[PDB]
């Protein structure tokens, strides 16, 4: 009977997902997530979790204990734009 | 599957399904019958009143090709009046080149070769229309042809196209069209299309009749109102 | 005539045949160019010579006019037909408006030729990126580049080809004002740039400078043998 | 569904799906209602907007001095048939020096739009033309559809949520062939308040009315001159 | 698997027109505001590299002396539409000896926007704002990859489009002045861009009834910034 | 209407044109035919069996002349053969209207094989399914050439095309030398067609054409019966 | 052989005023030595503020009128407003030049009001050159009418004569008298004088008889 | 009409209208409109059914794709 659709998050779906997967990690206080969700136009919730887990690794790469805003931006261009060869979505939006 | 997408491919048993699929679209149009009398041809089309909002005299399924040639169509109505435009244009090239009015054995030959031409290529689809051509001449008498979407034409003493095809032509052969003139035919044309289409499927419907012969002096036109009121007077006596 | 839309949109908003052609650029050999205030200096690396070939038929720096030079990357077969269509246009500019071609004008011709070619029927896009370098009238040296999608774009220093992100990261931590002080000192930036790339230790590099009034003048492998000595000699004593 | 890709392909049931999907495009646009008296032909449209500061998209267009149309669907194919519509009116006026009759205009459209419904790689025209005009026989209301099938009618309504407007027109069409221009219009205006949610109706900036009349050239009324017509309607019963 | 370019959806819209609507969500953001004193119109540049020359790119470009433009989404195919608009305003001047109105420029472009196919090949992936002062005063229009245009009063297009429109509906009123409309736009652009606001990341242009199309430059521009 | 304007013959990832490889399979399933040149003329002999006794064998011909001095046989499928015959009939005329000279046999094969290569690259067409044997005596010396559906050609002394062609080429290798007359090559062309025919090789199951310096001609079944007699 | 041209006569007259414009012509159509009709005026009303007069080959005059009237509608359906008088003159110059190597044999004068309510007269050659003037006369008797309006309207060649602007009253009787003088000496100048007056309130029309040789 | 028996239905319904705005359904889908319309009224807390509750139930059974589509007409 019911045919519930799971589409991609729009903008406020995306900003809410960043708040879920980054509420439990040592961050700089003064970063804005709304700027980050404008950089991921057609992205899934599984990719957004992988951005948040990757950007915590860059803090572990050098020394530090809390991530920065530029630690996020080094994660976006690696996950969104450097893994864009695979992307898994655009031949499944047409469901083929 | 895959053998039935284009009209350029045969099946593994040797037939084309895109023509057969377009033949199936004809039996969702309603019913058009036409029989020829001793000295003329009488068409007849029952017209479904889809809603009250349409106007009496709309979207006629009964065309007028030449001065003496008539057409009654059944199928996807956009392809009906598109075939009516080339047949109206084909008769104009005959009179302009050869001087006189086109005969039916040539007119239905030129149209059926135009319909057949779209059953060969992948770039175009077959038409979704079947239709009838009837006329009267003073040197050839009455003629009656019929064309399927594949492109096959034959002569007929009476034919039927629409939803109930066999259920219409069962009662046509009860008549005697060899000797009746085209006056009492008009009452018998209407009667065999009241017994079809039970009132469960449709609420109300519209009668539309056509008429040609030397009683119409060779010209094709619609029946007058009073004559088809006599046939609609001869409607509700089929309840006995 | 073959009528088929090759380049179409993706369901998320990309042009796949464009960005597939950008990866054909991303494995061609590296081309680096900076500009001085009086002498531009650009030089490809990875000549990749096999010592049995004619050295002049493998060149990737050509000239479009006396003032405009051009290097590229990507695949060479698409390059030298864009070049020959640019040679006709910059010659047809002179039959029109009398002055020689400004360096900004010839980039707009290549970029607009390359865009509409990602738009027509039955054509894959070009798979090259270019560096257009010239010192125009009134002696203002400047350079540009051209993406395969057709976006012309000026720079102060740039690099394309295989290993272009690492060289571009190297230049921003190295491009000062006094790096372009002398005409021989700007060359020491380029030779330090491509040595920080695929190896090319004096044997696979070919710099080619232009002193705003000359044509292109390629230095033979004797001054590069001299410059890579002294660029490494200063590196030898400081560290 | 492999039978669901190109206009050429017939279904095994015999229904071409690309034509049936262009019917979905005309159901997306906003509603509009046309109707006629013995001597007049009035069509009423309902505009939409995107934000409260953007303007409202117009739908009633002027073809000739005795023919006007109303569109529903994507607006780019509407202007493609509109520039065909204007061209076929003024050349008949150039050749024969007469107004081109309405019933003979629409058959040119039906032959125009049937052509891309049969070739390969050619979309149909998604558009919702309601046509009002004058022959020498009085007013005419015509509707079309992307299946290239034009209909002669006396009152119709097309667009999003238009079935509720048709039920209003059936139970009042016995009164239409008698009334003057005044309550002919507000018969049609009571159809547009039928096709709305129960809170906003007719706030003088989203509705337009076009009339051709027996001694009256085709005239479009927009958002100030609507207000004489729009006053004189009762409140919505609840 | 592969459809053609000219196919309707089961929901009825199209495929590649709707895909091109998604493509202008990757472009840089742009704001135009219509005011009865005149039309102000701003954009960001999205500077990528320090080695990049900043002024070589542009988003504001003029069509005629009294009409400006602003582009978003892709850039390389925007230059095709700009050139068709410049030629169209000069054919109208040549044959009618007057200035083409701002609305009639837009439908001259919007007829071109949906003409692809397989005869005579994809829709254009840009979005445009047209600011101009014709004889009906200052105007502001916005077209689509679908070819649908409508007059707006304060339209914000780009990657931060829907975030800016909400913050723009609250400050706009019908009786603005141009001196405060310029200041109100750079407050919005200060929020939505990534880098800090200075005299090189953005540029503006205003058209007036009195003077012609004027584009600001990096000398008169930063007095707005330091007095934000 | 119009065409397709795209090649339906592409390279395999192993680097082989697959449709040409399939067209050679249709050539190998054709009727067997041999061709032998020997020092004064060329002998072309084929194998023509009607399927039943109802067919009129004097109606169609396998061996066809192109000009006064050029004949041509095939081994493949029927209707493709008559197309490039009528093409090659025309190509010999445009050489003659320019130069006023009968065409050399080499220059005909230059232009017939150029048609077949052009036809396996252009848009929307399948390649031909025939291979040819072309004879002729230009400037004294005779010639014997063989084309293929790919568009190449060769210069044979003696060869066989059709079914069991790999057995005929071993049979001709043990038979042919440099020094034979025309009537000897006729006798060994029947002796190699007897390797694959049925039991009855009558005067109408085969068809033989020869070249001399007197020109190409085709044998009537009278003397074909005399050659078939006292054979094997 | 078949000569594609003939001369059908006609004489038109336009005078620009301060708040008005007056366009007048005869009503005789005639070629050779014969008369076709005694009623064929050349006053064509384009808009409510623009009237054209067309003299010369009459077949082109019927054609060129219908080409113009189509493009006034195409302008309005593309620009939502009617053409001004100066826009019609700029459009017509491209129309006449479009047949540069097989020209219309038409003399054209456009009279009407501008955007400020003042008179405007645009005279044309058969090729498509034009200028704005205060009074022109074209057609057959153009060489008779142009000297008389230099003296009265232009106030030329006079000494110690005041320069009063032409009133609407004075310009009517000045038009009515200059056709009576042209009717005596020109064989083509016709029988009824149609006068069309373009003011800020619409177009008035008036018919004055002449002699009928 | 059959599956609307056990619901409290106001006399504001037009089954002639409701059968005509539901084309191309089967007996399952016409049954499935009555259950979904019988649940929308429980969302807004209504007890009886109105016309639009059926009209909203149709849009759920068709299972359309919402994508920001109001730039038509």
Tell me if residue F197 falls in helix, strand or coil: coil
CB atoms within 10 A of CB F121: 12
Query: Could you give the angle at the alpha carbon of A22 between the alpha carbons of A17 and A23, nearest 5°?
Result: 100
Residue D208 has what DSSP assignment?
E
- Pairing status of strand E202-207 against strand E38-44: antiparallel
Question: Taking a C-beta distance cutoff of 8 angstroms, is the pair F225, F203 a contact?
Answer: yes
Residues 6+ apart with CB under 8 A from A5: H63, H65, H66
Relative orientation angle of helices A45-61 and A12-21, to the nearest 10 degrees: 40
Q: Hey, CA dihedral for B163, B165, B170, B172, is it positive or negative? A: positive
Q: What are the start-end ranges of the H helices in chain B?
A: 17-24, 77-98, 104-116, 166-172, 184-191, 225-233
- Sheet with C31-35, strands from edge to edge, namely C157-160, C31-35, C40-44, C206-210, C217-218
| Calpha distance G47→G37 (Å, rounded) | 27
| Calpha distance E205→D49 (Å, rounded) | 27
Tell me if residue A2 falls in helix, strand or coil: coil
- Whose CA is closest to E90, among E70, E108, E69? E108
End-to-end CA distance of chain F: 57
List b or e across G134-171, with b for residues whose CB sees 16 or more CB atoms inside 10 angstroms: ebbbbbbbbebbbeebeebbeeeeeeeeeeeebeeeeb
> What CATH number has the domain bearing residue B157?
3.60.20.10
Chains that contact G by 3+ CB pairs under 8 Å?
A: D, E
Q: Hey, CA dihedral for E2, E6, E11, E16, is it positive or negative? A: positive
| Phi, psi of E45, rounded to the nearest 5 degrees | -110, -30
Question: Taking a C-beta distance cutoff of 8 angstroms, is the pair F175, F181 a contact?
Answer: no
Contact yes or no, C with B (3+ CB pairs under 8 Å) = no
- Token pair in block for residue B152: 């096959």
Residues 6+ apart with CB under 8 A from D141: D34, D35, D36, D41, D43, D130, D131, D132, D153, D154, D155, D156
Tell me if residue F19 falls in helix, strand or coil: helix
Query: Could you give the angle at the alpha carbon of G101 between the alpha carbons of G100 and G106, nearest 5°?
Result: 60
Question: Which of D2, D8, D151 has the CB atom closest to B54's CB atom?
Answer: D151
Tell me if residue F95 falls in helix, strand or coil: helix
D182 in B contact zone (CB under 8 Å):
no
End-to-end CA distance of chain H: 35
Q: Which residues of B touch D (CB under 8 A)?
A: 1-2, 4-6, 17-18, 21-25, 28, 51-55, 57-59, 76-79, 81-82, 85, 118, 122-126, 128
Contact B21 D156 (CB under 8 A): no
Q: Which of A5, A8, A32, A38 to probe by mutation at the E interface, max E CB count within 10 Å? A: A38
| Calpha distance G176→F107 (Å, rounded) | 92
Q: Hey, CA dihedral for D166, D169, D170, D171, is it positive or negative? A: positive
C175 in E contact zone (CB under 8 Å):
yes
| Calpha distance C228→F135 (Å, rounded) | 71
Residue with tokens 């190109």: D6
Q: Hey, CA dihedral for F113, F115, F116, F121, is it positive or negative? A: positive
| Calpha distance H39→E223 (Å, rounded) | 61
Could you list the residue range(s) of the whole structural domain that residue B209 is in?
1-240
**Number of folded domains that form chain B:** 1
| Calpha distance B186→B235 (Å, rounded) | 12
Q: Which of D12, D14, D150, D151 to probe by mutation at the B interface, max B CB count within 10 Å? A: D14
Residue D230 has what DSSP assignment?
H
Residue with tokens 């070919």: C206
| Calpha distance D88→D63 (Å, rounded) | 10
Residue H59 burial (10 A CB sphere; 0-12, 13-18, 19+): exposed
- Token pair in block for residue B15: 């037939």
Chain D: nearest CA to E110, how far in angstroms?
8
| Calpha distance G115→E224 (Å, rounded) | 40
Query: Chain E to chain H, count of Cβ pairs less than 8 Å apart?
Result: 11
Residue A85 has what DSSP assignment?
T
- Backbone gaps in chain H, preceding residues (C–N over 2.5 A): none
Query: Chain E to chain G, count of Cβ pairs less than 8 Å apart?
Result: 21
Cα of G4 vs its chain's centroid, Å: 24
| Phi, psi of C142, rounded to the nearest 5 degrees | -150, 165
Query: Chain A to chain E, count of Cβ pairs less than 8 Å apart?
Result: 14
- Whose CA is closest to G104, among G143, G135, G66, G146? G66
CA-to-CA separations, B87 to B76, B128, B145, in angstroms, rounded = 17, 16, 14
Residue with tokens 């009195």: E210
Query: Looking at chain F from residue 88 to 127, which residues have their Cβ under 8 Å from any Cβ of chain C?
Result: 123
Radius of gyration of chain G (CA): 17
| Calpha distance B119→B2 (Å, rounded) | 18
Contact B125 D169 (CB under 8 A): no
Chain D residues touching residue E13 (CB < 8 angstroms): 25, 28
Contact D107 B54 (CB under 8 A): no
- Partners of C62 in the beta sheet? C70
Tell me if residue F53 falls in helix, strand or coil: coil
CB atoms within 10 A of CB B96: 8
Q: What are the start-end ranges of the H helices in A1-96?
A: 12-21, 34-37, 45-61, 69-79, 90-93
CA-to-CA separations, G196 to C115, D191, G131, G207, in angstroms, rounded = 58, 49, 22, 9
- Partners of D140 in the beta sheet? D133
| Calpha distance C112→C91 (Å, rounded) | 17
- Whose CA is closest to D57, among E30, E143, G76, E154? E143
| Phi, psi of E78, rounded to the nearest 5 degrees | -70, -30
| Calpha distance E133→F16 (Å, rounded) | 66
- Token pair in block for residue B89: 């244009």
- Token pair in block for residue G45: 């009303």
- Whose CA is closest to E67, among E181, E176, E182, E214? E214
| Calpha distance C177→B160 (Å, rounded) | 93
B98 in F contact zone (CB under 8 Å):
no
CA-to-CA separations, B153 to B23, B106, B128, B159, D38, in angstroms, rounded = 15, 11, 16, 12, 45
Could you list the residue range(s) of the whole structural domain that residue F66 is in?
1-232
Contact A38 E159 (CB under 8 A): yes
Chain C residues touching residue E16 (CB < 8 angstroms): 8-9
| Calpha distance C81→C79 (Å, rounded) | 6
Residue B214 has what DSSP assignment?
G
| Calpha distance G59→F102 (Å, rounded) | 66
B78 in F contact zone (CB under 8 Å):
no
Question: Taking a C-beta distance cutoff of 8 angstroms, is the pair B235, B194 a contact?
Answer: yes
Contact H32 A3 (CB under 8 A): no
| Calpha distance F214→D179 (Å, rounded) | 104
List b or e across G83-103, with b for residues whose CB sees 16 or more CB atoms inside 10 angstroms: bbbbbbbbbbbebbeeeeeeb
Phi-psi category of residue H38: left, alpha or beta, with phi > 0 → left and psi -120 to 50 → alpha: alpha
Phi-psi category of residue E97: left, alpha or beta, with phi > 0 → left and psi -120 to 50 → alpha: left
- Token pair in block for residue F82: 């008559």
- Whose CA is closest to E101, among E127, E61, E70, E134? E134
Residue C107 burial (10 A CB sphere; 0-12, 13-18, 19+): buried
Residue E101 has what DSSP assignment?
P
> What CATH number has the domain bearing residue F150?
3.60.20.10
Tell me if residue D231 falls in helix, strand or coil: coil
Residue with tokens 């009123």: E173
CB atoms within 10 A of CB F203: 18
Q: Which of G68, G77, G78, G79 to probe by mutation at the E interface, max E CB count within 10 Å? A: G79
Contact yes or no, H with D (3+ CB pairs under 8 Å) = yes
Chain D residues touching residue H51 (CB < 8 angstroms): 164
| Calpha distance B88→B93 (Å, rounded) | 9
Q: Which residues of E touch C (CB under 8 A)?
A: 5, 15-16, 19-20, 22-23, 25-26, 49-53, 56-57, 74-77, 79-80, 116, 118-119, 121-123, 125
| Calpha distance C43→C227 (Å, rounded) | 14
Experimental approach was cryo-EM
- Please report the beta strands in chain D, taking only residues with DSSP state E, as ranges in sequence order: 32-36, 40-46, 60-62, 67-70, 130-135, 138-143, 151-153, 155-158, 207-213, 216-222
Chain E residues touching residue A3 (CB < 8 angstroms): none
C1 in F contact zone (CB under 8 Å):
yes
| Calpha distance B189→B178 (Å, rounded) | 14
Residues 6+ apart with CB under 8 A from D126: D22, D25, D26, D73, D74, D77, D146, E8, E12
**Number of folded domains that form chain F:** 1
| Phi, psi of F135, rounded to the nearest 5 degrees | -115, 175
Contact A42 E159 (CB under 8 A): no
| Phi, psi of B107, rounded to the nearest 5 degrees | -70, -45
Residues 6+ apart with CB under 8 A from F17: F9, F10, F11, F120, F150
Question: Taking a C-beta distance cutoff of 8 angstroms, is the pair C12, E22 a contact?
Answer: yes
| Phi, psi of D54, rounded to the nearest 5 degrees | -75, 155
CB atoms within 10 A of CB H30: 17
List b or e across C5-33, with b for residues whose CB sees 16 or more CB atoms inside 10 angstroms: bbbbbbbbbbbeebeebeebbbebbbbbb
Cα of D173 vs its chain's centroid, Å: 18
Cα of G114 vs its chain's centroid, Å: 16
Tell me if residue F44 falls in helix, strand or coil: strand
CB atoms within 10 A of CB B222: 15
- Whose CA is closest to F99, among F91, F109, F111? F91
Q: What are the start-end ranges of the H helices in C54-182?
A: 76-95, 103-116, 165-172
DSSP C158-225: EEESTT-HHHHHHHHTT--SGGGSSHHHHHHHHHHHHTTSS---SSS-EEEEE-SSS--EEPPTTHHH
| Calpha distance B107→F69 (Å, rounded) | 53
CB atoms within 10 A of CB D38: 12
Query: Looking at chain E from residue 98 to 137, which residues have their Cβ under 8 Å from any Cβ of chain H?
Result: none
CA-to-CA separations, H67 to C205, E13, E22, F184, in angstroms, rounded = 55, 10, 11, 86
Tell me if residue E70 falls in helix, strand or coil: strand
Residues 6+ apart with CB under 8 A from B38: B142, B177, B178, B179, B180, B181, B182
| Calpha distance B224→B211 (Å, rounded) | 10
Q: Which of G65, G69, G73 to probe by mutation at the D interface, max D CB count within 10 Å? A: G73
């Amino acid at each position: 009977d019911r045919k519930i659709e799971f589409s991609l998050p729009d903008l406020e779906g995306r900003t809410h997902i960043f708040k879920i997967h980054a509420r439990s990690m040592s961050v700089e206080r003064d970063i804005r997530f709304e700027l980050l969700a404008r950089l991921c136009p057609n992205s899934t919730g599984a990719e957004i979790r992988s951005v948040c887990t990757e950007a915590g690794m860059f803090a572990i790469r050098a020394r530090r204990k809390i991530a920065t805003e530029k630690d996020f931006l080094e994660a976006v261009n690696k996950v969104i734009k450097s893994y864009a060869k695979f992307s898994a979505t655009p031949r499944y939006m047409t469901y083929n | 599957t895959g053998y039935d997408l284009s009209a350029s491919t045969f099946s593994p048993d040797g037939r084309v399904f895109q023509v057969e699929y377009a033949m199936k679209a004809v039996e969702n149009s309603s019913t058009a019958i036409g029989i020829r009398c001793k000295d003329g041809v009488v068409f007849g089309v029952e017209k479904l009143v889809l809603s009250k909002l349409y106007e009496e005299g709309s979207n006629k399924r009964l065309f007028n090709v030449d001065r003496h040639v008539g057409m009654a169509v059944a199928g996807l109505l956009a392809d009906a009046r598109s075939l009516a435009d080339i047949a109206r244009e084909e008769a104009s090239n005959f009179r302009s080149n050869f001087g006189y009015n086109i005969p039916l054995k040539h007119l239905a030959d030129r149209v059926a070769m135009y319909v057949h031409a779209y059953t060969l290529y992948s770039a175009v689809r077959p038409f979704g229309c079947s239709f009838m051509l009837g006329s009267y001449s003073v040197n050839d008498g009455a003629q009656l042809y019929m064309i399927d979407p594949s492109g096959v034409s034959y002569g007929y003493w009476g034919c039927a196209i629409g939803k109930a095809r066999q259920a219409a032509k069962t009662e046509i052969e009860k008549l005697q069209m060899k000797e009746m003139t085209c006056r009492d035919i008009v009452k018998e044309v209407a009667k065999i299309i009241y017994i079809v289409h039970d009132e469960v499927k449709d609420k109300a419907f519209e009668l539309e009749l056509s008429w040609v012969g030397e009683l119409t002096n060779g010209r094709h036109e619609i029946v007058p109102k009073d004559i088809r009121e006599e046939a609609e007077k001869y409607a509700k006596e089929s309840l006995k | 005539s073959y009528d088929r839309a090759i380049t179409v949109f993706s369901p998320d908003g990309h042009l796949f045949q464009v960005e597939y052609a950008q990866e054909a650029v991303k494995k061609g050999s590296t081309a680096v160019g900076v500009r001085g205030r009086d002498i531009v200096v650009l030089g490809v690396e990875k000549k990749s010579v096999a010592k049995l070939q004619d050295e002049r038929t493998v060149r990737k720096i050509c000239a479009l006019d006396d003032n405009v030079c051009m290097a590229f990357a990507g695949l060479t077969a698409d390059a030298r037909i864009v070049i020959n269509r640019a040679r006709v246009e910059c010659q047809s500019h002179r039959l029109t408006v009398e002055d020689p071609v400004t360096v900004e004008y010839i980039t707009r011709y290549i970029a607009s030729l390359k865009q509409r070619y990602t738009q027509s029927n039955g054509r894959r896009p070009f798979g090259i990126s270019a560096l257009i370098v010239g010192f125009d009238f009134d002696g203002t040296p400047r350079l540009y580049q051209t993406d395969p999608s057709g976006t012309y774009h000026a720079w102060k220093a740039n690099a394309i080809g295989r290993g272009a992100k690492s060289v571009r990261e190297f230049l921003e931590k190295n491009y000062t004002d006094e790096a372009i002080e002398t005409d021989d000192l700007t060359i020491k930036l380029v030779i330090k740039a491509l040595l920080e790339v695929v190896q090319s230790g004096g044997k696979n590099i070919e710099l080619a400078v232009m002193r705003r009034d000359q044509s292109l003048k390629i230095l033979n492998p004797e001054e590069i043998e001299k410059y890579v000595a002294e660029i490494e000699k200063e590196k030898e004593e400081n560290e | 569904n492999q039978y669901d890709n190109d206009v050429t392909v017939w279904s095994p049931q015999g229904r071409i799906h690309q034509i049936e999907y262009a019917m979905e495009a005309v159901k997306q646009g906003s509603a509009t209602v046309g109707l006629k008296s013995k001597t007049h032909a009035v069509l009423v449209a309902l505009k939409r907007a995107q934000s409260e500061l953007a303007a409202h998209q117009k739908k009633i267009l002027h073809v000739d001095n005795h023919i006007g149309i109303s569109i529903a669907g994507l607006t780019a194919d509407a202007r493609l048939l509109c520039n065909f519509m204007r061209q076929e009116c003024l050349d008949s006026r150039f050749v024969f020096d007469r107004p081109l009759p309405v019933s003979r205009l629409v058959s040119l459209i039906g032959s125009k739009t049937q052509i891309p419904t049969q070739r390969y790689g050619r979309r149909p025209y998604g558009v919702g033309l309601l046509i009002a005009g004058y022959d020498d026989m009085g007013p005419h209301i015509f509707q079309t559809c992307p299946s290239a099938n034009y209909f002669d009618c006396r009152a119709m309504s097309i667009g999003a949520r238009s079935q509720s407007a048709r039920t209003y027109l059936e139970r009042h069409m016995s009164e239409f062939m008698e009334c003057n221009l005044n309550e002919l219009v507000k018969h049609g205006l009571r159809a547009l308040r039928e096709t709305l949610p129960a809170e906003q109706d007719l706030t003088t900036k989203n509705v337009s009315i076009g009339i051709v009349g027996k001694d009256l050239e085709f005239t479009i009324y927009d958002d100030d001159d609507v207000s004489p017509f729009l006053e004189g309607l009762e409140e919505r019963p609840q | 698997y592969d459809r053609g370019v000219n196919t309707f959806s089961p929901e009825g819209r199209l495929f590649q027109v709707e895909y091109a609507i998604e493509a202008i969500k990757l472009g840089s953001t742009a704001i135009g505001i219509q005011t009865s004193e005149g039309v102000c119109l701003a954009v960001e540049k999205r500077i990528t590299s320090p080695l990049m020359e900043p002024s070589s790119i542009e988003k504001i470009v003029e069509i005629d002396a009294h009409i400006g433009c602003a582009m978003s989404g892709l850039i390389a195919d925007a230059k095709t539409l700009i050139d068709k608009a410049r030629v169209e305003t000069q054919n109208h001047w040549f044959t009618y000896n007057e200035t083409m109105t701002v609305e009639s420029v837009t439908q001259a472009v919007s007829n071109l926007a949906l003409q692809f196919g397989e005869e005579d090949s994809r829709p254009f992936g840009v979005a445009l704002l047209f600011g101009g002062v014709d004889e009906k005063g200052p105007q502001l229009f916005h077209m689509d990859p679908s070819g649908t245009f409508v007059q707006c009063d304060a339209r914000a297009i780009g990657s931060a489009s829907e975030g800016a429109q909400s913050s723009l509906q609250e400050v706009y009123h019908k009786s603005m002045t141009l001196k405060e409309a310029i200041k109100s736009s750079l407050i919005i652009l200060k929020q939505v861009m990534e880098e800090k606001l200075n005299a090189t990341n953005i540029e503006l242009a205003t058209v007036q009834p009195g003077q012609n199309f004027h584009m600001f430059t990096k000398e008169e521009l930063e007095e707005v910034i330091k007095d934000i | 209407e119009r065409g397709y304007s795209f090649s339906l013959t592409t390279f395999s990832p192993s680097g082989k044109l697959v449709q040409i490889e399939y067209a050679l399979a249709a050539v190998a399933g054709g009727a067997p035919s041999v061709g032998i040149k020997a020092a004064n003329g060329v002998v072309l002999a084929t194998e023509k069996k009607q399927k039943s006794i109802l067919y009129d064998e004097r109606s169609v011909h396998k061996v066809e002349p192109i000009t006064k001095h050029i004949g041509l046989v095939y081994s493949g499928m029927g209707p493709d053969y008559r197309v490039l015959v009528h093409r090659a009939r025309k190509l010999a005329q445009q050489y003659y209207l320019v130069y006023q000279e009968p065409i050399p046999t080499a220059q005909l094969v230059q232009r017939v094989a150029s048609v077949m290569q052009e036809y396996t690259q252009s848009g929307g067409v399948r390649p031909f399914g025939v291979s040819l044997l072309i004879c002729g005596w230009n400037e004294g010396r005779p010639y014997l050439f063989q084309s293929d559906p790919s568009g190449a050609y060769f210069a044979w002394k003696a060869t066989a095309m059709g079914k069991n062609y790999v057995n005929g080429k071993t049979f001709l290798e043990k038979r042919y030398n440099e020094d034979l007359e025309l009537e000897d090559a006729i006798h060994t062309a029947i002796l190699t067609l007897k390797e694959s025919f049925e039991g009855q090789m009558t005067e109408d199951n085969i068809e033989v054409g020869i070249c001399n310096e007197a020109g190409f001609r085709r044998l009537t079944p009278t003397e074909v019966k005399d050659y078939l007699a006292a054979i094997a | 052989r078949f000569s594609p041209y003939v001369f059908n006569g006609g004489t038109i007259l336009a005078i620009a005023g301060e708040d008005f414009a007056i366009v007048a012509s005869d009503t005789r159509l005639s070629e050779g030595f014969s008369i076709h009709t005694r009623d064929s005026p050349k006053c064509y009303k384009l808009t409510d503020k623009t009237v054209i007069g067309c003299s010369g080959f009459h077949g082109d005059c019927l054609t060129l009128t219908k080409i113009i009237e189509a493009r006034l509608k195409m302008y309005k359906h593309s620009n939502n407003k009617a053409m001004t008088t100066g826009a019609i003159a700029a459009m017509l110059s491209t129309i006449l030049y479009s047949r540069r190597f097989f020209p219309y044999y038409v003399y054209n004068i456009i009279g009407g009001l501008d955007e400020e309510g003042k008179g405007a007269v645009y005279s044309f050659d058969p090729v498509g050159s034009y200028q704005r003037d205060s009074f022109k006369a074209g057609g057959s008797a153009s060489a008779m009418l142009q000297p008389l309006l230099d003296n009265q309207v232009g106030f030329k060649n006079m000494q110690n004569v005041e320069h009063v602007p032409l009133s609407l009253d004075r310009a009517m009787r000045l038009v009515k008298d200059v056709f009576i003088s042209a009717a005596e000496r020109d064989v083509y100048t016709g029988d009824a004088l149609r006068i069309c007056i373009v003011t800020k309130e619409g177009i008035r029309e008036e018919t004055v008889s002449l002699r009928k040789d | 009409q059959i599956h609307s028996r056990k619901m409290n239905v106001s006399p504001d319904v037009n089954y002639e209208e409701l059968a005509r705005c539901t084309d191309d359904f089967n007996g399952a889908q016409c049954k499935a409109v009555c259950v979904e319309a019988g649940m929308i009224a429980l969302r807004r807390g209504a007890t009886e059914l109105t016309h639009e509750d059926y009209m909203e139930g149709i849009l759920e059974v068709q299972a359309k794709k919402k994508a920001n589509l109001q730039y038509y007409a």
